[PDB]
Each structure stands twice: as structure tokens, then as C-alpha cells.
Amino acid sequence: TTALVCDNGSGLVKAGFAGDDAPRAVFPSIVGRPRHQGVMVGMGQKDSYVGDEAQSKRGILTLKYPIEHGIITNWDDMEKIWHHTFYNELRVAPEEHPTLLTEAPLNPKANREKMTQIMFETFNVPAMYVAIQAVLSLYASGRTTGIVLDSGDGVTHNVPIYEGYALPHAIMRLDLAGRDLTDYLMKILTERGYSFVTTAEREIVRDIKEKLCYVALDFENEMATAASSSSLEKSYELPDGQVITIGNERFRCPETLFQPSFIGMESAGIHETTYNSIMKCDIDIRKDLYANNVMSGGTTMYPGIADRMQKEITALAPSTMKIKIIAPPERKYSVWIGGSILASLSTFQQMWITKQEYDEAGPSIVHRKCF
Amino acid sequence: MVVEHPEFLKAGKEPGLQIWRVEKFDLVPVPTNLYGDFFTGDAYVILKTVQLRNGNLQYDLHYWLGNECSQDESGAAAIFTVQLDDYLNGRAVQHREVQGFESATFLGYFKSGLKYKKGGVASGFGPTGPFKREELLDHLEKQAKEFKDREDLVPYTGEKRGKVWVPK
Numbered sequence A: 001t002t003a004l005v006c007d008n009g010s011g012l013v014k015a016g017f018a019g020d021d022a023p024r025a026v027f028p029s030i031v032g033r034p035r036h037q038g039v040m041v042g043m044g045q046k047d048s049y050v051g052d053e054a055q056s057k058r059g060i061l062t063l064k065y066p067i068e069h070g071i072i073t074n075w076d077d078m079e080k081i082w083h084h085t086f087y088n089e090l091r092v093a094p095e096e097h098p099t100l101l102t103e104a105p106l107n108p109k110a111n112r113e114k115m116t117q118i119m120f121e122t123f124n125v126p127a128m129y130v131a132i133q134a135v136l137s138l139y140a141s142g143r144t145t146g147i148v149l150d151s152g153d154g155v156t157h158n159v160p161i162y163e164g165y166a167l168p169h170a171i172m173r174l175d176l177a178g179r180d181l182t183d184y185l186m187k188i189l190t191e192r193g194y195s196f197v198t199t200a201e202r203e204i205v206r207d208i209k210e211k212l213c214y215v216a217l218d219f220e221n222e223m224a225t226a227a228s229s230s231s232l233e234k235s236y237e238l239p240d241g242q243v244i245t246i247g248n249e250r251f252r253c254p255e256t257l258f259q260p261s262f263i264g265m266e267s268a269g270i271h272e273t274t275y276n277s278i279m280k281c282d283i284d285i286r287k288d289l290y291a292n293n294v295m296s297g298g299t300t301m302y303p304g305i306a307d308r309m310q311k312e313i314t315a316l317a318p319s320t321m322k323i324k325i326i327a328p329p330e331r332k333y334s335v336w337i338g339g340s341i342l343a344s345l346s347t348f349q350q351m352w353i354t355k356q357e358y359d360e361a362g363p364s365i366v367h368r369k370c371f
Numbered sequence B: 001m002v003v004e005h006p007e008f009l010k011a012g013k014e015p016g017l018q019i020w021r022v023e024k025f026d027l028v029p030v031p032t033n034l035y036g037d038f039f040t041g042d043a044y045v046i047l048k049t050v051q052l053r054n055g056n057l058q059y060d061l062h063y064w065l066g067n068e069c070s071q072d073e074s075g076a077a078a079i080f081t082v083q084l085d086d087y088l089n090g091r092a093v094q095h096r097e098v099q100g101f102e103s104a105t106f107l108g109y110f111k112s113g114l115k116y117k118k119g120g121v122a123s124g125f126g127p128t129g130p131f132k133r134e135e136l137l138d139h140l141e142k143q144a145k146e147f148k149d150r151e152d153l154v155p156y157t158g159e160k161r162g163k164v165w166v167p168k
């Protein structure tokens, strides 16, 4: 009997089998429906697409994302994604597999219940469990105490965790993450004369972002280097063989994480929210948080971000603090890997919500068993 | 809950030192004659139980991570530690111990001095001139035109396969 692990994010589904060291299926968390092309369709037609297909056909589809800022908001399309994940990507019968799902920090009670309800009533799973994403990442790093910076495509959180459990009162949420950074990079490339603003061009912008962007250790110094020389420029080959040149856009883009005002957001940057989160915690545990800042999620992947965070937190913290930033190379999948480990433990068997427990108690059991 | 694992049932029942090694996603006791001889390719969980004068037992849980241990082992050691603490009603103080950086307290559990040895149990894991935008767009569209829909899909119909829960 093999359990499934599904880590649903705003941008990407990570799904696979408990016990594997990585998700077997990683694909866009999107449902696409055809745009009008001049004639009313015209039935019997595939009226929807999910994941990789939807992305490939984005030019002629309108895309919807069922998860917004890490929270499930379109339940109909979320069910479609889960269905597609089981049957068309993992190719399993859900009724044959205990299923571990993940959730955002501070996920509303009603949402946890609906997830539970859908897994049992729609997919007839034999058992299920819901774990907090940042906590899984912390476990994946081999720690029970630390503060996670989890930053994906739709949301960034600071989550302090002590002796295994998140401290909800100190969690910080920032609605600024990878999609905003892609939008911003598109904007500043347009400023430079490269207008990549249609859905067809979006993937070019994401690729430039993931390949060429980096966090400067000292931003304003870096800006001066870029103005004073061509030493930071990179050429980039477009899919049609055209070659473009980009300069200070490389580090301006993720600077936004530290300076959200670059895209007009009034929020403090991720170094300040990290500090503010720690400062909401008991003084007695702060030392352990400072020494265990764990980065999780794809938007923490920028080269130089760990060193930059190390610098900023050091400036904010008492000089007596040992500051350490942990940024595993596999951190695009650290949530998923933590779930894979958890669901594999000999001790996890009695932790699942079983079908029978659900059929007797109903969705509210999730608040007592997934805690 | 609760974890019904045989080693949980034994944990912290009396004053002493108990050591387990993570082996393929399980918590396996270490033979007592090998206490203190740590495989650097492995992760361990250590429970020190001390009799308090008030009659209660005091608990310190240490999870020890060898330099070469795999991510499944270190992750499991951390999770087992949380689980054991919860089983012991949250009373245990948790400690992360890294090879080469162990606490004085942990080192003091081993009166002949702890020793390292290489090895361990295997992981449980199974240029072109000015930018011509029109040219780029034509290319992208040509690529898109050639994309064919998957024909192998199980269609989503919104069918409910499980039993609908009704309150009593």
C-alpha cells in the first residue's frame, strides 16, 4: 500500500508517491478554456484543459488558477486539478491510496473541511491527511525548530516553528511572490524595449527570470556597476534564435522581495517580515529562530538571496545573535519531500484520517486529527 | 493518534538512556553494547530520562545527525522527535545535535566518550540586431499551432465516488 503526496501551490502542483525522493509530476496549477476565435463553437469539443496542455495552448485559452495566494478559492476547478493529477499524471485509482495533501499556513477552517470532504466524497480515498507546507519544509531540513521563509508563485510566508509546531500568532503573510516578479520583469524588459506582454511570450519572461536573475548583496552598488560598465550584462537567446541583452533587470527584479514598493506595494520586504515574525515570538526562543532560518519554495531560488538575507537580518538583530540561513538546493520541492518522509514513517499509520472515521464524524474531524 | 509503535510504548518508562537509529523510515533500537558508537552515515534519536525528586520523570530528546546521513534519515529523526515528545505529553526538551558540534550535555551521556564510525544503513528513499517582435510572435504561434491535444485523458465529470456524509 503506497500513499500519495500532493503539494498544491498557487502556480504548480507537485505530486508523487510517499517514499520517493522527489515528486514524479510537477505541472501548472491551471485550467484553460478556449478563447473565442470568430465562430461560436461547435460542441463535442474539449471545452477544458489542465496543467501542461493548458500551458502549451495558452495562446488560445483563458487560464484560471484555482489557488490564489496559496488558498483554494475555486473549488470546482480545484476538483478538476485533483482529478487530473490522480488519473492523468500519476495514473492511479485514488480509492486505492492514502493521500497526503498540504495546506497554507492559516488556511481557513472551512477550507480544510472542504478539502477533506472532497477527498472522501468525490475521490473515495481510503485515508487522508493535511499538513502545513512550511512545517513539512522544516522537517525536510532535519529540524524541529526554525523560521521558514516559504515563497512560491503566489504567496510568501514567514512561519516560526518551535519543537515541531508553528506559532500561528507570529506567522506573516505577504501577497508578493514569483508571479509578481515575473509581471515586474515583463514590465522592466518592456522599459528596455522588449515588450513580452502577451500570454504567448509569458514563458520567455519566466525563463529569463529563473535563469538570469539574482539578488545583489548591495543593490545600489550593483546599480552603479551596471551603469558604469557592461560587466553584468547577459545575452539571452529567444526561441526563434533572436538574441537579446539584459542588464540591471537581472537584479532589479528580485530586489522587489526586499523593496516591494518597486511594484507599488506598501508592504515591508522579506527581511523585515522575517525580523517582525521573530519579534512576535517569545524572547526565549528567538535565538533558535535566528540560527535556523530555512528557505523554501521556488522564489527563494535566486542566487545570492541567502547571503543577502544573512546580511539584512544581521543588521536588524542584536549583535549577540548567531544568524544562519539554510537554503537547500532542492528547496523547490522541500514541502513535497517533507510530506514524502512524513507519510512513509512507520508511526504515521495511525495519524491518517480513515474513511470510516470520516463516514462517522464528517469533515470536522480534520481539526482534531490534522493539527 | 496515538502512535502505537512498540518502541514508543518502551520510551521513557524508567530513568536511563535510550538510543534508536532511523532505519528505512522506522525507529529501531540500538543494541545497548553499541551505545556511543555512531555511524556518520546515519541519524539517531536519543532519550535521556532522569528521575525528578518530585517523582516525575524529566526528558531530553536529542536527534543526532551524521555528516553523511540522507535527507530521509534526518527528516525522520526530526519527526520522530516531535512525535515522541507529544507521546510524552510535550514534557521533553528537544535538541538538534550535529556531528562535530554536539552539546556538552549530549557528549556527557557517554562516559567513555562518543565515537564516530564511517558507514550506515541505506536510505529509505525508493548579435541579431534590433529586436524584431513580429518575427518572435510568428514563431511562437507556429509552435503553438503544431501542439496536439492529449487523447488519453480520463475526463472529469464531477462524479462523486465516495459516500456523502450526513449529520445525525
Ligand SMILES: Nc1ncnc2c1ncn2[C@@H]1O[C@H](COP(=O)(O)OP(=O)(O)OP(=O)(O)O)[C@@H](O)[C@H]1O
Pocket: A008, A009, A010, A011, A012, A013, A069, A070, A151, A152, A153, A154, A155, A156, A177, A178, A179, A206, A209, A210, A211, A296, A297, A298, A299, A300, A301, A302, A332
Ligand atoms: N530558479 C528560479 N529562480 C527564480 N524563481 C524561480 C526559480 N525556479 C522557480 N521559480 C519560481 O518559483 C515559483 C514556483 O515555486 P513553488 O512551486 O514553490 O510555488 P507554488 O507552491 O506553486 O506557489 P505558492 O507557494 O506561492 O502557492 C514560480 O514563480 C517560478 O517562476
Ligand SMILES: [Ca+2]
Pocket: A008, A009, A010, A133, A152, A297, A335
Ligand atoms: Ca507552495
Ligand SMILES: [Ca+2]
Pocket: B041, B042, B043, B068, B069, B070, B073, B119, B120, B121, B122, B123
Ligand atoms: Ca544512512
Ligand SMILES: [Ca+2]
Pocket: A163, B085, B090, B091, B092, B093, B094
Ligand atoms: Ca517538549
